[PDB]
Protein backbone atom coordinates (compact mmCIF):
# COMPACT_ATOMS: atom_id res chain seq x y z
CA UNK A 1 0.00 0.00 0.00
CA UNK A 2 1.06 3.57 -0.79
CA UNK A 3 0.26 6.50 1.50
CA UNK A 4 -1.20 3.83 3.74
CA UNK A 5 -0.53 3.12 7.41
CA UNK A 6 0.58 0.26 9.64
CA UNK A 7 -2.41 -1.94 10.50
CA UNK A 8 -3.58 -2.26 14.12
CA UNK A 9 -3.25 -5.82 15.47
CA UNK A 10 -6.19 -8.03 14.46
CA UNK A 11 -7.58 -5.32 12.15
CA UNK A 12 -8.09 -7.68 9.20
CA UNK A 13 -8.16 -11.22 10.60
CA UNK A 14 -9.15 -12.34 7.11
CA UNK A 15 -6.09 -11.06 5.23
CA UNK A 16 -4.10 -14.12 4.07
CA UNK A 17 -0.63 -14.37 2.47
CA UNK A 18 -0.03 -16.41 -0.69
CA UNK A 19 3.50 -17.76 -0.19
CA UNK A 20 5.41 -20.06 -2.54
CA UNK A 21 7.62 -22.95 -1.44
CA UNK A 22 10.57 -23.10 -3.83
CA UNK A 23 11.56 -20.39 -3.79
CA UNK A 24 10.11 -19.14 -0.51
CA UNK A 25 8.59 -15.72 -1.24
CA UNK A 26 5.42 -13.62 -1.31
CA UNK A 27 3.10 -14.03 -4.26
CA UNK A 28 -0.04 -12.14 -3.31
CA UNK A 29 -2.74 -11.28 -0.79
CA UNK A 30 -5.90 -13.38 -0.30
CA UNK A 31 -8.90 -13.60 2.02
CA UNK A 32 -10.55 -16.08 4.39
CA UNK A 33 -14.29 -16.46 3.73
CA UNK A 34 -14.81 -19.79 5.49
CA UNK A 35 -12.65 -22.29 7.36
CA UNK A 36 -11.38 -24.06 4.21
CA UNK A 37 -11.84 -21.52 1.41
CA UNK A 38 -9.67 -18.59 0.34
CA UNK A 39 -10.40 -15.84 -2.20
CA UNK A 40 -7.79 -14.08 -4.36
CA UNK A 41 -7.00 -12.68 -7.80
CA UNK A 42 -6.80 -15.40 -10.49
CA UNK A 43 -3.75 -13.63 -11.86
CA UNK A 44 -1.89 -14.52 -8.67
CA UNK A 45 -1.91 -18.07 -10.01
CA UNK A 46 -2.30 -17.78 -13.78
CA UNK A 47 -0.68 -15.21 -16.04
CA UNK A 48 0.62 -17.00 -19.13
CA UNK A 49 2.16 -13.78 -20.42
CA UNK A 50 4.72 -13.94 -17.61
CA UNK A 51 4.80 -17.73 -17.59
CA UNK A 52 2.96 -17.78 -14.27
CA UNK A 53 1.18 -21.10 -13.69
CA UNK A 54 1.04 -22.05 -10.01
CA UNK A 55 -0.55 -25.27 -8.77
CA UNK A 56 -1.62 -26.31 -5.29
CA UNK A 57 1.58 -28.33 -4.91
CA UNK A 58 3.50 -25.06 -5.30
CA UNK A 59 1.46 -23.11 -2.75
CA UNK A 60 0.97 -22.71 0.98
CA UNK A 61 -1.44 -20.32 2.74
CA UNK A 62 -0.42 -18.19 5.73
CA UNK A 63 -3.29 -16.90 7.86
CA UNK A 64 -3.12 -14.74 10.98
CA UNK A 65 -0.17 -12.68 9.80
CA UNK A 66 0.78 -9.17 10.84
CA UNK A 67 4.51 -9.26 10.10
CA UNK A 68 5.41 -9.64 6.44
CA UNK A 69 8.73 -11.47 6.57
CA UNK A 70 8.72 -13.46 9.83
CA UNK A 71 7.22 -16.72 11.03
CA UNK A 72 4.69 -15.49 13.60
CA UNK A 73 5.22 -18.42 15.86
CA UNK A 74 2.04 -18.99 17.88
CA UNK A 75 -0.28 -16.73 15.85
CA UNK A 76 -0.07 -17.48 12.14
CA UNK A 77 -1.35 -20.63 10.49
CA UNK A 78 0.29 -22.30 7.49
CA UNK A 79 -1.87 -24.50 5.29
CA UNK A 80 -1.57 -26.55 2.14
CA UNK A 81 -4.05 -26.50 -0.73
CA UNK A 82 -6.22 -29.40 -1.84
CA UNK A 83 -7.27 -27.65 -5.05
CA UNK A 84 -7.42 -24.39 -6.99
CA UNK A 85 -10.49 -23.27 -8.94
CA UNK A 86 -10.22 -20.44 -11.45
CA UNK A 87 -13.21 -18.67 -12.95
CA UNK A 88 -13.47 -20.65 -16.17
CA UNK A 89 -13.85 -17.25 -17.85
CA UNK A 90 -10.90 -15.43 -16.31
CA UNK A 91 -9.71 -13.13 -19.10
CA UNK A 92 -5.94 -13.08 -18.62
CA UNK A 93 -5.92 -12.28 -22.31
CA UNK A 94 -7.21 -8.71 -22.44
CA UNK A 95 -8.22 -6.92 -19.22
CA UNK A 96 -8.17 -9.30 -16.26
CA UNK A 97 -11.96 -9.61 -16.39
CA UNK A 98 -13.16 -12.22 -13.89
CA UNK A 99 -9.88 -12.06 -11.97
CA UNK A 100 -11.09 -14.28 -9.14
CA UNK A 101 -9.97 -17.70 -7.87
CA UNK A 102 -10.91 -19.86 -4.87
CA UNK A 103 -8.49 -22.18 -3.06
CA UNK A 104 -9.34 -25.19 -0.93
CA UNK A 105 -7.36 -26.04 2.19
CA UNK A 106 -6.43 -29.68 2.70
CA UNK A 107 -7.64 -29.14 6.28
CA UNK A 108 -9.80 -26.40 7.77
CA UNK A 109 -8.47 -23.75 10.13
CA UNK A 110 -9.41 -23.09 13.74
CA UNK A 111 -10.39 -19.43 14.09
CA UNK A 112 -8.99 -17.13 16.78
CA UNK A 113 -8.36 -13.45 17.54
CA UNK A 114 -6.09 -12.98 14.52
CA UNK A 115 -7.81 -15.38 12.11
CA UNK A 116 -11.42 -14.73 11.13
CA UNK A 117 -13.70 -14.77 8.11
CA UNK A 118 -14.88 -11.72 6.21
CA UNK A 119 -18.44 -11.59 4.90
CA UNK A 120 -19.36 -11.88 1.24
CA UNK A 121 -21.84 -9.22 0.20
CA UNK A 122 -25.53 -9.63 -0.44
CA UNK A 123 -27.62 -7.89 -3.09
CA UNK A 124 -28.74 -5.11 -0.75
CA UNK A 125 -25.47 -4.43 1.07
CA UNK A 126 -23.83 -3.88 -2.30
CA UNK A 127 -26.60 -1.53 -3.41
CA UNK A 128 -26.34 0.50 -0.23
CA UNK A 129 -22.56 0.58 -0.03
CA UNK A 130 -21.19 0.36 -3.58
CA UNK A 131 -22.10 4.05 -3.86
CA UNK A 132 -19.81 6.73 -5.31
CA UNK A 133 -18.19 8.81 -2.58
CA UNK A 134 -18.33 6.00 -0.02
CA UNK A 135 -15.11 4.56 1.40
CA UNK A 136 -13.57 1.13 1.66
CA UNK A 137 -10.41 -0.25 3.22
CA UNK A 138 -7.52 -2.01 1.47
CA UNK A 139 -4.79 -4.09 3.11
CA UNK A 140 -1.60 -5.79 1.98
CA UNK A 141 2.12 -6.37 2.23
CA UNK A 142 2.81 -4.90 -1.21
CA UNK A 143 5.29 -2.29 -2.40
CA UNK A 144 5.14 0.92 -0.36
CA UNK A 145 5.75 3.17 -3.36
CA UNK A 146 5.60 2.76 -7.13
CA UNK A 147 9.45 -0.48 -0.76
CA UNK A 148 8.43 -3.47 1.35
CA UNK A 149 6.69 -2.75 4.65
CA UNK A 150 7.62 -4.62 7.83
CA UNK A 151 3.97 -4.80 8.87
CA UNK A 152 0.59 -4.96 7.07
CA UNK A 153 -0.45 -1.60 5.59
CA UNK A 154 -3.95 -0.11 5.30
CA UNK A 155 -5.81 2.75 3.59
CA UNK A 156 -9.25 4.19 2.89
CA UNK A 157 -10.23 5.09 -0.66
CA UNK A 158 -13.61 6.32 -1.92
CA UNK A 159 -15.52 4.74 -4.81
CA UNK A 160 -15.06 6.67 -8.06
CA UNK A 161 -17.97 7.06 -10.48
CA UNK A 162 -17.96 4.82 -13.54
CA UNK A 163 -17.20 7.52 -16.12
CA UNK A 164 -14.25 8.91 -14.22
CA UNK A 165 -12.88 5.38 -13.81
CA UNK A 166 -13.41 4.87 -17.52
CA UNK A 167 -11.75 8.17 -18.44
CA UNK A 168 -8.51 7.36 -16.61
CA UNK A 169 -7.20 4.42 -18.65
CA UNK A 170 -6.66 2.88 -22.07
CA UNK A 171 -7.74 -0.54 -20.76
CA UNK A 172 -11.30 -1.77 -21.26
CA UNK A 173 -13.30 -1.72 -18.03
CA UNK A 174 -16.15 -4.14 -17.36
CA UNK A 175 -19.09 -4.54 -15.02
CA UNK A 176 -17.18 -6.99 -12.80
CA UNK A 177 -14.87 -4.04 -12.10
CA UNK A 178 -14.80 -0.92 -9.92
CA UNK A 179 -12.16 1.75 -9.23
CA UNK A 180 -11.27 3.75 -6.13
CA UNK A 181 -9.02 6.65 -5.16
CA UNK A 182 -9.20 10.36 -4.39
CA UNK A 183 -9.58 12.75 -7.31
CA UNK A 184 -6.29 14.63 -7.67
CA UNK A 185 -7.88 17.94 -6.67
CA UNK A 186 -8.91 16.64 -3.24
CA UNK A 187 -5.66 16.95 -1.28
CA UNK A 188 -5.73 13.38 0.06
CA UNK A 189 -4.33 10.39 -1.80
CA UNK A 190 -3.29 6.73 -1.53
CA UNK A 191 -3.45 3.51 -3.55
CA UNK A 192 -2.97 -0.23 -3.85
CA UNK A 193 0.37 -1.37 -5.33
CA UNK A 194 2.20 -4.45 -6.61
CA UNK A 195 2.16 -7.32 -4.13
CA UNK A 196 -1.27 -6.39 -2.76
CA UNK A 197 -3.26 -8.44 -5.29
CA UNK A 198 -5.79 -11.01 -4.21
CA UNK A 199 -6.11 -8.52 -1.39
CA UNK A 200 -9.50 -7.47 -0.09
CA UNK A 201 -11.53 -4.30 -0.44
CA UNK A 202 -13.88 -4.28 2.55
CA UNK A 203 -16.55 -1.98 3.95
CA UNK A 204 -18.46 -1.86 7.23
CA UNK A 205 -22.22 -2.13 7.13
CA UNK A 206 -23.77 0.75 9.03
CA UNK A 207 -26.67 -1.65 9.51
CA UNK A 208 -25.17 -4.71 11.20
CA UNK A 209 -21.63 -3.40 11.82
CA UNK A 210 -20.21 -6.34 9.88
CA UNK A 211 -17.31 -6.07 7.46
CA UNK A 212 -17.88 -7.20 3.89
CA UNK A 213 -15.34 -7.83 1.15
CA UNK A 214 -16.62 -5.86 -1.84
CA UNK A 215 -13.54 -6.08 -4.09
CA UNK A 216 -10.28 -7.92 -4.77
CA UNK A 217 -7.08 -6.01 -5.59
CA UNK A 218 -6.94 -6.59 -9.32
CA UNK A 219 -4.94 -4.07 -11.31
CA UNK A 220 -3.78 -0.53 -11.94
CA UNK A 221 -1.25 1.31 -14.08
CA UNK A 222 1.27 2.57 -11.52
CA UNK A 223 0.78 3.27 -7.82
CA UNK A 224 -0.66 6.48 -6.38
CA UNK A 225 -0.70 8.68 -9.47
CA UNK A 226 -2.86 11.76 -10.11
CA UNK A 227 -5.76 11.20 -12.51
CA UNK A 228 -5.28 7.43 -12.13
CA UNK A 229 -7.06 4.85 -9.96
CA UNK A 230 -7.04 1.31 -8.58
CA UNK A 231 -9.22 -1.47 -10.01
CA UNK A 232 -10.88 -4.24 -8.01
CA UNK A 233 -12.80 -7.38 -8.99
CA UNK A 234 -16.51 -6.74 -8.23
CA UNK A 235 -17.22 -9.68 -5.94
CA UNK A 236 -21.01 -9.50 -5.63
CA UNK A 237 -21.15 -9.83 -9.41
CA UNK A 238 -19.05 -13.00 -9.35
CA UNK A 239 -20.86 -14.07 -6.22
CA UNK A 240 -22.88 -16.68 -8.04
CA UNK A 241 -19.79 -18.43 -9.37
CA UNK A 242 -18.42 -18.56 -5.83
CA UNK A 243 -21.41 -20.42 -4.38
CA UNK A 244 -21.41 -22.79 -7.36
CA UNK A 245 -17.90 -24.18 -6.81
CA UNK A 246 -18.68 -24.16 -3.10
CA UNK A 247 -21.84 -26.23 -3.48
CA UNK A 248 -20.11 -28.69 -5.81
CA UNK A 249 -17.06 -29.26 -3.62
Amino acid sequence: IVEGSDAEIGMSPWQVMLFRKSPQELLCGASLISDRWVLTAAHCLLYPPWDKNFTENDLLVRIGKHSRTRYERNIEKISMLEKIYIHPRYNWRENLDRDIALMKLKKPVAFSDYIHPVCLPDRETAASLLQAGYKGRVTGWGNLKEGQPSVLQVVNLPIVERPVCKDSTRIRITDNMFCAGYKPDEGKRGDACEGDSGGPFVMKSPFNNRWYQMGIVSWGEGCDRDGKYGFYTHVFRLKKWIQKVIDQF
Partner: peptide
Protein backbone atom coordinates in the same frame (compact mmCIF):
# COMPACT_ATOMS: atom_id res chain seq x y z
CA UNK B 1 -22.77 -16.51 10.60
CA UNK B 2 -20.06 -14.66 12.50
CA UNK B 3 -18.15 -13.31 9.50
CA UNK B 4 -16.99 -9.70 9.47
CA UNK B 5 -16.92 -9.37 13.27
CA UNK B 6 -13.32 -9.00 14.46
CA UNK B 7 -12.64 -10.70 17.80
CA UNK B 8 -10.45 -7.84 19.02
CA UNK B 9 -12.71 -5.07 17.67
CA UNK B 10 -16.43 -5.33 16.89
CA UNK B 11 -16.73 -8.10 19.50
CA UNK B 12 -15.04 -5.95 22.17
CA UNK B 13 -16.96 -2.86 21.08
CA UNK B 14 -13.57 -1.32 20.37
CA UNK B 15 -13.41 0.87 17.26
CA UNK B 16 -10.27 1.13 15.10
CA UNK B 17 -8.42 4.36 14.45
CA UNK B 18 -9.82 5.13 10.97
CA UNK B 19 -13.02 3.09 10.61
CA UNK B 20 -15.07 6.11 11.67
CA UNK B 21 -13.80 7.60 8.40
CA UNK B 22 -15.81 5.03 6.47
CA UNK B 23 -19.13 5.24 8.33
CA UNK B 24 -18.92 8.99 7.90
CA UNK B 25 -18.51 8.82 4.12
CA UNK B 26 -21.71 6.80 3.89
Amino acid sequence: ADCGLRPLFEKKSLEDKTERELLESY
